[model samples]
Target: ANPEHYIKHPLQNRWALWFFKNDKSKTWQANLRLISKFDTVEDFWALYNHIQLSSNLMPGCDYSLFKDGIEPMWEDEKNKRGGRWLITLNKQQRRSDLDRFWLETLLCLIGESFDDYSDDVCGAVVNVRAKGDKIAIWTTECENRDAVTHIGRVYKERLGLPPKIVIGYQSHADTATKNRFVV
Candidate 1:
């Protein structure tokens, strides 16, 4: 038997995993740490299975996966001009939906579920908080209305979120200023 016999699928782009732990003593950027980077499906699963699931993270913690060169921060060059489609989850849903939703989001990224606009995707984040949980998919250009909306529509449908369960897309600029527009 040889490890080389295993077949591995490569992603369109390499991605970095980031972990954030809230610490009042440290700066926001300081709290965010790079975990690892992976470009193959096998390596991704290895990282996923070895890490804590979103549901198991402590409050005020977050897990982010971003394209190789893009940092999971609003100030990152690639992210400065973009935004995210946010999915807010109620605390009650954590027990029943958190893990599943997170997994779906990951699949969307790795499986390139966004069609041609998949290239427009930067990454995603899952935040664990005391109030509730949040999952957001980040896109590269906020002003590309067609691409942005298509990404949102496909994301919502793929997650199996009900038509009535509305999600909102907000630009990093708008979100920074406490201003946001819903699609």
Candidate 2:
């Protein structure tokens, strides 16, 4: 008699998990894989517990949790006009803050922690690298300053980041080169 199987809390959005491991021999798309999708809170937890924590992923690997309908790529129709609120953490912080910050980022996405602006959120990504790790929350529209700023501010606060630590917003298009919006 386990309620875990019988009861589930549904989230506002269904999210798809994608994993990427850089392999020099393969094409960019070939290195990416869709792991699973989930809409229920219990299911999310189940998947979360089953996977390796972000901190444990190898360098050059990435985990992206995007809305079910959106692919975690700049070329996706829903993503082309969007931008991301990016947080960069150094190698030292990877041991102390990467996992915690990444989990909090996931919670923020699934829990709709951004108020009405949450609708503007498309998903998020975490990249593990030799130099450092990066976490970014992707939003639907780069032109929407109000939503962009609101989301960045809320995300930073949710991560329990100090007020002085600023984060940046870069549109998908501009990222190919490198104006950034900072919060």
Candidate 3:
């Protein structure tokens, strides 16, 4: 019998981890950090468990996990035409909902919970800030309404966000210029 016979479920694609630390002196691209990459369920959990949860991170820092080959930035070729579904959190929810929501986001991504349109997903980001926190999921093309809407619906359902609470999708271009909002 093979000593390493235990089977592990593998994800369809590899993912890269990035961390953003606000540094006024550095360009936004420079501030984004690439932590590591992984393609297996075990590796994903190992990374997730080892890192500080979104709620525990200091203000102004962000953690993003994007598909391999895509940089977690608006300027990346894969992301320039993309957008994100934003989940704005109130300060009070930090201690209670932040970690849970972020973990669920990770699980959704790793498990391909978006079904056929899961390929449109680029990754996710959690922004920890004193003003308020945010968790956003990035997708490849904002113009693909069907895929985008499917992703948003699936993501919201997976997070168990109540129907009373609505999320918005905004394009990176619009967000960069400060005119972003959900459709």
Candidate 4:
């Protein structure tokens, strides 16, 4: 007989996980898909443990999590004014730090560890690139530097990153080279 099965602890926000696998032969839409959506802690782990770890994905692949109904894109209505706190990891860090950091990032989201600023948080995306692995937490208002930095500081601490390591927040409309708010 199966063990007791009770409804799992639900998260405050329903979230969707997205996957992007770069395929030159296919249209961008075809390369991206909504993997699944989950609002419960148990369901989240079931899905997480069932999938390939971020460290194992090939370069050009990405895993994104966003509040339900919000696409993981710069143009999404909830994301247009938002920016993200970016963390760039070198190739070597992939085997060493990628999975741990990604798990911690997910925990931060489900736990809503950012306090008042948590409401402004959109979601997070981790991109696996040959050059470097990048993970970012998107926030609804890039103009709110106070909240953005606060989120970044706590997020960095949550990931156990040390002080010497710098993280930057940048808005969707701004060019990566010109506009970055460091935290």
TM-score of each: 0.93, 0.95, 0.92, 0.93
Output the better candidate (3/4) by lDDT.
Answer: 4
* Candidate 1 clashing pairs, residues 3+ apart or interchain: none
Model 1: ten consecutive residues of lowest lDDT:
174-183
Instruction: Estimate, for each residue in 89-127, the C-alpha lDDT of model 4 and write its tens digit.
Output: 998999899999999999999889989889999999999
Q: Which segments of candidate 2 are over 4 A away from where they belong? A: 1-5, 177-179
lDDT digits (tens) for residues 1-183 of candidate 3: 664578666888999999999989999888978998999888988888899887778899999998889888888898999999999999999998999998899889988898899988999999999999999999989889899988988888888888888889989988886324343
Tell me the deviation in Å of residue 57 in model 1: 0.9
Model 2 residue 81 CA deviation in Å: 0.9
Cα lDDT tens digits, model 1, 19-59, are 99999999999999999999999999999999998888899
User: Which structure among the candidates has the greatest TM-score?
Assistant: 2
RMSD of each: 2.2, 2.2, 2.2, 2.8
Candidate 2 local lDDT, 1-183, one digit each (tens): 977677888999999999999999999999999999999999999999999998899899999999998999889988999999989999999999999999999999999998999999999999999988999999888999999999988888888899889889999999965446888
Residue 21 miss distance in model 4 (angstroms): 0.8
Task: Tell me which residue pairs clash in candidate 2.
Answer: none
Error of 1 at 136 (Å): 0.3
